């Protein structure tokens, strides 16, 4: 139908404004992680040289 | 179910499957054949605990037929929407039967051989077991490789390029695709230089592997002094396609190409820039309307990044430098003087000495005798530019040309055969001219 | 089933939906058949909020480009020889509906180089009118 | 059969604009998880020369 | 120079003129930045629907994606136009007619 396809258009557009925030969203939480495991690096680069001194 | 599923299921990648899907279906013939085990024939009318029977039955088996009703029986069930999950914990649970399901892949016919290597896909497509040598193993197979490579069957070829760009996901696994991707890049280069659902394919999914194959930097400089001419049909596909998602994703492969984290990145991005005359086909492409936000901001990037040809143009070292090299490109160094008054500056220097030994040069070169080839026509033509640049910069160039005798053999040449050359040693003659009657 | 002249003419009234990427080609393809007329939705907002507004005017640009080459052609009494392949066109155009091309950009990108060539003779002209002028100076003589 | 084809075209466009949506969501995941390791790259190398 | 300008400078012309009426047409157009561009609606006649359904078939095939291009038909209020199908011999007595 003529309506039912101007509401799937709709619907579809809807569906792409999702998958475009999903996206957003996707990048944030990528951001986020990006820094936690950098501190969780940075926290074991200094145990590992801590630990390399009490060897030494 | 399951951890994903194939990119691929339109043209031939399923229409084989639908083909096959019925074909002497369920395996009813072992009943009377007797060369397969009840327990295969068993397997099949339930597919029409089980993993390792199934595959052991299809690698023992030695029947053409049998061969390709069991490839489609693993490729359905890689597919299946109630048995993927079902398929991915075997190969995670028990790995160990992976590889000889990737050992009994690559054979039989074309269609055959393409549908063992699509559950071969799938079956390596999941988050666990990767199996990196595996997968470079299977990478190795002649009938695979040749079936990528080769472009006969539009559709088979289409198939493989979903198949390779599925597979790029992991980056454990993209890495070893650089390696060894001199056996199949530059087929998709041929691809990509050429250029309905079976084109976007050969569009979209072929240059999604060129931007995750950009990912790693180390890499991307590695392919890219291999494939320059592919970078610059690269650079023109990327406004020639159509459909967006094509130039997106060209766009984004080009801005990681030039991203500065590649080694020489900063002189390599300006060496193709000048190289291809990629400024007006950029400013061009940021004129033009924007239907995706990444594209907006890969324009941007690009936009910023052309700032490169700008620093270049104002090293009036690097035009004075080209000048005394044998080799001038006209880039937007040759342009210095019209960029800016510091070239006229320095070309002034040792009472127009500076000018005139360029001057000398250009007419030592002009009476060499070798102008006549084209790019030493560029050359040629390049040199009378900058001439009629430097002629109408000050008077005293024209008075050290015309004492030099440079400025009567340019009159002399102005009857260039090339057409640019012509045109630019007019150029160059008028500008002469219109300060000589001044 | 067509409609002929009988009573109070015919028309109806329909909805267009494109995809984006696809709207230079379905409007090139519109306008060689001739068939519809769009209504002016979006044209209840100003002149000003045009969604091609710089691309309007990019082609004015090229169009004040045209009109100083058909200048100079008049200038030069140029015989225009490609108005009798602009009739082909125009045939091509009202039969098979050729495609319009993307290329446009490259077209806008020729039209500043024949301004380019246009400044240049320009000059040149000045030139030889500096020439003429230097030529009187010739005359003199013992 | 006229409305029928208009009605599957109808949702064949909504299924064509979902499945750009859809590929341009994983491009732009699959390059900001690529973005997110050079990030953690850069920042660990920079820690690293910081601690040592 | 100007001799070979000559040679394409009034097709070149015509397709610069072409390109600015698709622009104005386009511009007139309903469409939307973020949502699929070009969705718009217009006027047409009745017999003219199949033919513009094909002649939209063959740009889709000959279009570098496979995207479906098709119409819809829905009811409004407001005046519709009107269209002589003018023969070439009944155009001149038509717009004679209707001055």
């Known amino acids: 139908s003529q309506k039912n396809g101007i509401a799937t258009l709709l619907q579809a557009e809807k569906e792409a404004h999702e998958i475009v925030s999903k996206a957003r969203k996707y990048r944030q939480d990528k951001l986020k992680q990006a820094k936690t495991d950098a501190a969780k690096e940075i926290d074991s680069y200094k145990i590992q040289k801590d630990k390399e001194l009490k060897e030494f | 179910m399951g951890a994903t599923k194939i990119l691929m299921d339109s043209t031939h990648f399923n229409e084989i499957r639908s083909i096959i899907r019925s074909r002497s279906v369920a395996w009813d013939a072992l009943a009377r054949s007797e060369e397969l085990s009840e327990i295969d024939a068993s397997t099949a009318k339930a597919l029409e605990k089980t993993l390792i029977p199934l595959i052991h039955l299809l690698s023992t088996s030695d029947n053409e037929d049998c061969k390709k009703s069991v490839q489609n029986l693993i490729a359905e069930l890689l597919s299946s929407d109630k048995y993927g999950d079902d398929t991915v914990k075997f190969f995670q649970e028990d790995p160990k039967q992976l590889e000889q399901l990737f050992d009994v892949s690559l054979k039989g016919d074309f269609q055959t051989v393409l549908i063992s290597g699509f559950n071969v896909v799938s079956l390596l497509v999941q988050n666990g077991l990767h199996n990196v040598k595996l997968v470079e193993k299977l990478l190795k197979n002649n009938n695979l490789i040749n079936i990528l490579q080769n472009i006969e069957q539009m559709d088979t070829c289409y198939v493989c390029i979903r198949l390779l760009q599925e597979l790029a996901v992991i980056p454990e696994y993209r890495d070893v695709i650089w390696l060894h991707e001199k056996k199949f890049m530059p087929t998709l280069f041929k691809i990509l230089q050429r250029a309905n659902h079976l084109g976007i394919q050969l569009q979209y999914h072929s240059l999604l592997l060129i931007w995750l194959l950009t990912f790693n930097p180390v890499f991307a ?4 002094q291999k494939y320059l ?39 390599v991005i300006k060496q193709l820039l000048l190289l291809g005359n990629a400024l007006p086909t950029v400013q061009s492409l940021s004129e033009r309307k924007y239907s995706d936000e990444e594209l907006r901001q890969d324009i941007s990037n690009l936009k910023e990044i052309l700032e490169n040809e700008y620093q270049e143009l104002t090293s009036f070292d690097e035009y004075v430098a080209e000048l005394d090299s044998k080799l001038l490109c006209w880039s937007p160094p040759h342009v210095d003087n019209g960029f800016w008054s510091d070239n006229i500056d320095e070309f002034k220097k040792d009472n127009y000495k500076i000018f005139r030994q360029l001057i000398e040069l250009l007419q030592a070169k002009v009476r060499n005798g070798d102008v006549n080839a084209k790019q030493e026509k560029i050359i040629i033509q390049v040199a009378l530019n900058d001439i009629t640049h430097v002629v109408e910069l000050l008077p005293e160039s024209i008075d050290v040309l015309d004492k030099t005798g440079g400025k009567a053999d340019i009159m002399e040449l102005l ?24 | 089933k067509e409609e002929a002249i009988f009573r109070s003419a015919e028309m109806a009234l329909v909805q267009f939906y ?28 100003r002149a000003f909020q045009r969604t091609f507004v710089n691309e309007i005017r990019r082609l004015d640009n090229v169009e004040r480009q045209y ?76 | 059969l006229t409305p029928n084809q208009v009605n599957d075209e109808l949702n064949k466009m909504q299924a064509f604009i979902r499945k750009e949506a859809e590929e341009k969501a994983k491009e732009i995941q699959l390059k900001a998880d690529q973005e997110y390791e050079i990030e953690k790259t850069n920042i660990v190398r920079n820690e690293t020369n910081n601690i040592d | 120079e100007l001799y070979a300008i000559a040679k394409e400078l009034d097709s070149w012309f015509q397709d610069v003129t072409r390109e600015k009426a698709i622009f104005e047409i386009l511009n007139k157009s309903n469409y939307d930045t973020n949502r699929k561009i070009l969705i718009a609606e217009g006027w047409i006649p009745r017999d003219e629907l199949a033919t513009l359904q094909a002649r939209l078939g063959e740009m889709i095939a000959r279009l570098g994606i496979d995207v479906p291009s098709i119409i819809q038909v829905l009811d409004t209020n407001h005046t519709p136009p009107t269209f002589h199908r003018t023969n070439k011999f009944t155009a001149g007595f038509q717009s004679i007619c209707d001055c």
């Open chain 2, 221 to 224: 400089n590695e392919l890219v």
């Open chain 2, 229 to 267: 001419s592919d970078f610059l049909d690269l650079l023109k596909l990327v406004k020639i396609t159509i459909k967006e998602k094509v130039s997106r994703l060209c766009i984004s492969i080009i801005l990681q190409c030039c991203s500065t984290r590649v080694k020489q990145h900063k002189k």
């Open chain 2, 415 to 438: 009857n260039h055969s090339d057409s640019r050359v012509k045109y630019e040693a007019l150029k160059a003659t008028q500008a002469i001219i219109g300060y000589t009657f001044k």
């Open chain 3, 18 to 45: 494109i995809p984006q990427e696809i709207s230079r080609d379905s409007a090139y393809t519109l306008g060689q058949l001739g068939l519809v007329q769009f209504r002016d939705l979006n044209s209840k907002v």
């Open chain 3, 67 to 142: 009109r100083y080459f058909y200048s100079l052609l008049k200038k030069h009494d140029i015989k225009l020889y490609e108005g009798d392949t602009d009739k082909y066109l125009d045939g091509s155009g009202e039969l098979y509906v050729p495609p319009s091309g993307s290329v446009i950009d490259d077209y806008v990108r020729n039209a500043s180089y024949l301004e380019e060539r246009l400044i240049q003779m320009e000059d040149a002209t000045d030139q030889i009118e500096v020439q003429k002028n230097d030529l009187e100076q010739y005359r003199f003589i013992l």
